[PDB]
Design a binder for this molecule. Sequence first.
Ligand SMILES: Nc1nc2c(ncn2[C@@H]2O[C@H](CO)[C@@H](OP(=O)(O)O)[C@H]2O)c(=O)[nH]1
Ligand SMILES: Nc1nc2c(ncn2[C@@H]2O[C@H](COP(=O)(O)O)[C@@H](O)[C@H]2O)c(=O)[nH]1
Ligand SMILES: O=c1ccn([C@@H]2O[C@H](COP(=O)(O)O)[C@@H](O)[C@H]2O)c(=O)[nH]1
Ligand SMILES: [Mg+2]
Ligand SMILES: [Mg+2]
Lengths: 162, 161
Amino acid sequence: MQKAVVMDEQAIRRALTRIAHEIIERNKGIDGCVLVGIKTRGIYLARRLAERIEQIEGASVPVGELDITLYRDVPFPVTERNVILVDDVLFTGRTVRAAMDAVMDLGRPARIQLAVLVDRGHRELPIRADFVGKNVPTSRSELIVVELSEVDGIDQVSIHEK
Amino acid sequence: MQKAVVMDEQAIRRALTRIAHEIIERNKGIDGCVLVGIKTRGIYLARRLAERIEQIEGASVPVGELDITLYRVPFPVTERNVILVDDVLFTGRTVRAAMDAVMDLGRPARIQLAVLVDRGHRELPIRADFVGKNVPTSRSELIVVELSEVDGIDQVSIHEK
Ligand SMILES: Nc1nc2c(ncn2[C@@H]2O[C@H](CO)[C@@H](OP(=O)(O)O)[C@H]2O)c(=O)[nH]1
Ligand SMILES: Nc1nc2c(ncn2[C@@H]2O[C@H](COP(=O)(O)O)[C@@H](O)[C@H]2O)c(=O)[nH]1
Ligand SMILES: O=c1ccn([C@@H]2O[C@H](COP(=O)(O)O)[C@@H](O)[C@H]2O)c(=O)[nH]1
Ligand SMILES: [Mg+2]
Ligand SMILES: [Mg+2]
C-alpha cells in the first residue's frame, strides 16, 4: 500500500540534472565516458543522462544497454573507457556485481562507476554508487517503486509496505 | 624515498581492535561470520582479528586464505557472512576478483570488506565496510604496510619515487 511519494517529477528532474553535472565534473569532461543502463528502467535513466550531458557539454556520450537476465538467484565501448553503470535502484548490490562481470567480460575498462536514482541501503556486498539521486532509508520489508514516464506514464518514486 | 610513517605499531594495534569490535557490533554477534584474508598480509591481518574477536566475544571465527594471481578441510562460505580482509584498498580490482572467487565457491549471505588502509583512487564501485585508516595519496606514491609476521615490525608508510 503506497506509503508515501518520496520523489515527484520535479525532484527526479533536479536529481538527474545534478548527477549529470556530477558525472561531467568527476571525469573532467565526458571523453572516454560511456553510460550503461542496467535493465529497462536503468537504460531510460542512462538515456536521459546522456541527453543532459549532451545539453551541458555540447558533446554526446555513448549509451549501452544491459538486460541482466543472467542473474541466477548490442555491444558498446569498453577498453580504457570509463564505464558508468546506471540503475534506478540500489539494494543488495548483487545486480551491480553482475553488471561489472558483464562489462569486464566485454573488455578492459579504465574504470567503472555507478549512478543510481535511489539508494535504499541494505547492501550485501562491498559496493557503493559514485552518484546517488537520493538515499531513501527503508525497512527490509518495504519496496521502492520508481516510475518513469517512458514506461510508467509518469515520473515518481514511492515507498510501498505490505 | 620514504615520505613518512602514517601508522606505527600503536596505531595499527588500535585500528584492528576497533575493527574487531566494529565487525562484531555490525553483525550483532560473530555467529555465522567468517574471515578471509587476501594474500599474505591479508591473511595475517585476518588472524589478528580472529584472535581479538575471540578474546572479545569468546567464540572463534574461521579464517580462510585466498590468493589472487590465478584471478589477478572445506571452508564455510554459503549462507555465511564473508568478511574479506586485505591490507590496502587501492583500485578495488583485487576485491572484485576476491568476490568472484567467494561467490564461485558458494553462496554467502553477504560479503564484507575490511582493510587496514584505503588510499583511494578507486576504479570500481567498491568500498570497505571497515577501514583501519584512510590515507589520501597521489597516483605516483606507494603505501608500504609492514607486518611483524613478515617484515619484523608493524608500520605503515608513504614512499615517493
Ligand atoms: N512487486 C515487486 N517489485 C519488485 C520486487 N523486487 C524488486 N521489485 C521492483 O519492481 C519494479 C517494477 O515494477 C522493478 O524495478 P527495476 O526496473 O529497478 O528493476 C523491481 O526492481 C518484489 O519482490 N516485488
Ligand atoms: N526499484 C527497485 N528495485 C529493487 C528493489 N529491491 C530490489 N530490487 C531489484 O533488485 C535489482 C538489484 O538488486 P540489488 O542487487 O540492488 O539488491 C534491481 O534491478 C531490481 O530488479 C527496490 O527497493 N526498488
Ligand atoms: O600502495 C599500494 C597499493 C596497492 N598495493 C597492493 O595492491 C592490493 C590492492 O589492490 P587494489 O585495490 O589496487 O585492486 C593491496 O592488498 C596490496 O597487496 C600495495 O602493496 N601498495
Ligand atoms: Mg533497477
Ligand atoms: Mg593485500
